[PDB]
From a paper:
Here we present a model refinement protocol that automatically generates series of molecular models from [name] datasets, which describe the dynamics of the macromolecular system and have near-perfect geometry scores. Here, we present a computational method, similarly based on the GMM-DNN architecture, that builds a series of molecular models from a [name] dataset with structural variability. Each model in the ensemble would satisfy protein geometry constraints and fit to the reconstruction of particles from the same conformation at the target resolution. In addition to the FSC, we also introduce stereochemical constraints of proteins and RNAs to the loss function during DNN training, which ensures that the model at every frame along the trajectory has valid geometry.
To demonstrate the protocol, we start with a classical modeling task, where one atomic model is refined against one high-resolution [name] structure. The process involves large-scale morphing, residue-wise adjustment, and finally full atom refinement that considers both the map-model agreement and the stereochemical constraints. The modeling process starts from an existing homolog or predicted model, where we place one Gaussian function at each non-hydrogen atom. Using a DNN, we first refine the GMM so it fits the consensus 3D reconstruction of all particles. During the refinement, the map-model Fourier shell correlation (FSC) is used to guide the model fitting, and a cutoff frequency is set to avoid over-interpreting the high-resolution information in the map. In sum, for single model refinement tasks, our atomic model refinement protocol produces better models than results from existing methods, according to the [name] validation metrics. We again start from the [name] example (EMPIAR-10059), from which the movement of Ankyrin repeat domains has been observed previously.
Numbering used by the authors:
A (entry chain C), E (entry chain D): 560 to 603, 627 to 699
B (entry chain B): 211 to 502, 508 to 559
C (entry chain B): 700 to 719
D (entry chain D): 111 to 280
The structure:
């Protein structure tokens, strides 16, 4: 009765929220990641796999901000990258939580008799 | 006990009818109780929704009841009905009628008595008493009303001029925006200590939306955005000075060299001068409502300015610290830009 | 609040010709 | 003798008596009632549109007797069809008012005596709200009529005799 | 009819939330950033741009807290900055998110037949 709610919630959020979301997320990460590799020259910051993980830091909120000196042309990295951070941590995820808490609302209560089932 | 007859016997039998009841039981409630219909029996009668016996007392013979005896708090009957409306749809229904009623009758008997002028001791007109107490429905009413009748128009407020088929027009009076003399309704609902939640809604439709929409179109939107961009350049010049201040410790002391020097010491005076401005505007606010958070935004301009000023005095005691003060004032001012939106 | 900025900015503008 | 003010008062209080000797007056000087003189010169308003701002109970018999004079000088057709020439009620004729005053009867009489039924009203009042207002039913006395939800007069104005209202008038 | 919704919400937080928000944010940044450059003397934390960024991190969440041993005049840099951090990370954004979860409430559901258009 009381625990079998926390197991449906993790379960419904992974199937619905992630599928609707992991595509509209990989198209902001893949895109700016491919951009920072083109713009930037190096640092294990140019291998795309290492980028798409580094930029993934920011969203999960382990961001290092300005971790490097190596770039010709000065700021067109920081504005591209802030453009991502205001765009991706401060805008997308609140949408993603706000979906989830929009479910933690509904799958709390009329969910219940599905523990009977 | 609501009895037309024994009431009729006592008054045929010489009851005195200007007789006050002023125990603490009638003034506001200790809580003793209570309650306040304002003392005078006719105020008691109309306020007890006894249309017949407020008629009896006034049409009767042995002593018709006097209609303008302001009670001990100076509330007249019309002052008493308005203290007793409670914004229930049916409470408004009978008091708005009982009030409609006393004024149609004061017109009948004693047309000379302008009776919605009669102030209480605190100077309010009965309307100014409704509106200062968020009695939104009597205020929807004294402003909205027009009795159509003979001798009606002495009674009425807001006359309708042409009804085309879909529409109406109207001409409203108005006493209120232009009772600048004493207590405008707007001055009263515009302070608006609004500690009655009943206040804010009541700047809404009858005579007063369309009119404050109309001040703002005509002269005072235009004055506001002048009054706005003058603060912005006050803010840039005050940045500009604070931002190109020296390092040489013990400042200034003195400055002459060439041009930027000239342009800046102008920006340092132009800033404190607007600091003392707000400090001065803010004491005048604090004094006109000497005394009253009703006005949060009234405050933080003052707090900034007092930081312009405990800077300025420190610039002269030659404490090196004066900046710490002026840096707060500067963080404050750019934040005080925020209020000047109200309302986009 | 438009109205509080109004009811004052005329009270603090010398009580002048406006509809009244 | 009579002047404008003399009928525009007389109609105002529904006095068909202050217009009795009116029939033999406007035989003598040959003065008439559609004249610029007996219409208020600015509101295009005539002892009929003054009857129509001063309907009492949606009726009057100065309308019967006035229009019956205005027939007797044959001022009639223009007499029943001057419309407001100020910008505000502009091109609004007595049929516009009688319809705006919901009245099968003064309607059926004015269009018997030959009111015009394509008298355009085109002030800024009828087009969109400045704010003037207002409002926009679209001008033509029938579009007014249907637009004021009056299924019987619209049937009348179209299925009548004297001029059935044309339907496609933009 | 499952992804077309997420397209919209990013387009509508970006039109509504940002413009209504980005101005009540550049006054709390521009005025503290200005406050810092006057108050502090050096570090790539006086250049006004380098400070408006360094003050932007905190509000992202990438805050370097107390970075600088350099000032005359004792404590008042830390109050000025905490005042901004309790005021700007802890107190504005929760309003910005709370408005966005305020879109994500309604633009999730009766938004829907907008896809059909």
């Amino acid at each position: 009765q009381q625990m079998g709610i926390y197991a449906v919630m993790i379960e419904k959020m992974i199937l619905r929220d992630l599928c609707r979301f992991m595509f509209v997320y990989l198209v902001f990460l893949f895109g700016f990641s491919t951009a920072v590799v083109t713009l930037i020259e190096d640092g294990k910051y140019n291998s795309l796999y290492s980028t798409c993980l580094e930029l993934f830091k920011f969203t999960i909120g382990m961001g290092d901000l300005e971790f490097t000196e190596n770039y010709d042309f000065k700021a067109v990295f920081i504005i591209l990258l802030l453009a991502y951070v205001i765009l991706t941590y401060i805008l997308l995820l609140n949408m993603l939580i706000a979906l989830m808490g929009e479910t933690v609302n509904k799958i709390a209560q009329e969910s219940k008799n599905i523990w009977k089932l | 006990r609501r009895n037309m007859t024994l009431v009729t016997l006592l008054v045929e039998n010489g009851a005195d009818v200007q007789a006050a009841a002023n125990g603490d039981f009638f003034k506001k409630t200790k809580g003793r109780p209570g309650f306040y219909f304002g003392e005078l029996p006719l105020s008691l009668a109309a306020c007890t929704n006894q249309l017949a016996i407020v008629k009896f007392l006034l049409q009767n013979s042995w002593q018709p009841a006097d209609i303008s005896a302001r009670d001990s708090v100076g509330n007249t009957v019309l002052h008493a009905l308005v203290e007793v409306a409670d914004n229930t749809v049916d409470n408004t229904k009978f008091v708005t009628s009982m009030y409609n009623e006393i004024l149609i009758l004061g017109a009948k008997l004693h047309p000379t008595l302008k009776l919605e002028e009669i102030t209480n001791r605190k100077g309010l007109t009965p309307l100014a008493l409704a509106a200062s107490s968020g009695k939104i429905g009597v205020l929807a009413y004294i402003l909205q009303r027009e009795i159509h009748e003979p001798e009606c128009r002495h009674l009425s407020r807001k006359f309708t001029e042409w009804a085309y088929g879909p529409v109406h027009s109207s001409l409203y009076d108005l006493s209120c925006i232009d009772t600048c003399e004493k207590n405008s309704v707007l001055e009263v609902i515009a302070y608006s200590s609004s500690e009655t939640p009943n206040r804010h809604d009541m700047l809404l439709v009858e005579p007063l939306n369309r009119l404050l929409q109309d001040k703002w179109d005509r002269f005072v939107k235009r004055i506001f955005y002048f009054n706005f961009f003058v603060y912005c350049l006050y803010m840039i010049i005050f940045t500009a000075a604070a931002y190109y201040r020296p390092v040489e410790g013990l400042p200034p002391y003195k400055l002459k060299n060439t041009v930027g020097d000239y342009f800046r010491v102008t920006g340092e005076i132009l800033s404190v001068s607007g600091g003392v401005y707000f400090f001065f505007r803010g004491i005048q606010y604090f004094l006109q409502r000497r005394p009253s958070v009703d006005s949060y935004s009234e405050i933080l301009f003052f707090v900034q300015s007092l930081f312009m000023l405990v800077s300025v005095v420190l610039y002269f005691s030659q404490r090196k610290e004066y900046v710490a003060s002026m840096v707060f004032s500067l963080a404050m001012g750019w934040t005080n830009m925020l209020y000047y939106t109200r309302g986009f | 609040q438009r109205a509080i900025t109004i009811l004052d900015t005329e009270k603090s503008f010398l009580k002048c010709m406006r509809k009244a | 003798l009579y002047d404008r003010r003399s009928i525009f008062d007389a109609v105002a209080q529904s006095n068909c008596q202050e217009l009795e000797s009116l029939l033999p007056f406007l035989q003598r000087s040959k003065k008439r009632l559609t004249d610029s003189e007996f219409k208020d010169p600015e509101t295009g308003k005539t002892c009929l549109l003054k009857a129509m701002l001063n309907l009492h109970n949606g009726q009057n018999d100065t309308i019967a007797l006035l229009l019956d004079v205005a027939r007797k000088t044959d001022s009639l057709k223009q007499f029943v069809n001057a419309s407001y020439t100020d910008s505000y009620y502009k091109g609004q004729t007595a049929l516009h008012i009688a319809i705006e005053r919901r009245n099968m009867t003064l309607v059926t009489l004015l269009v018997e005596n030959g009111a015009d039924v394509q008298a355009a009203a085109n002030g800024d009042f009828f087009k969109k709200t400045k704010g003037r207002p207002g409002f926009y039913f679209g001008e033509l006395p029938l579009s007014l009529a249907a637009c004021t939800n009056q299924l019987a007069i619209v049937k009348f104005l179209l299925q009548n005799s004297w001029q059935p209202a044309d339907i496609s008038a933009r």
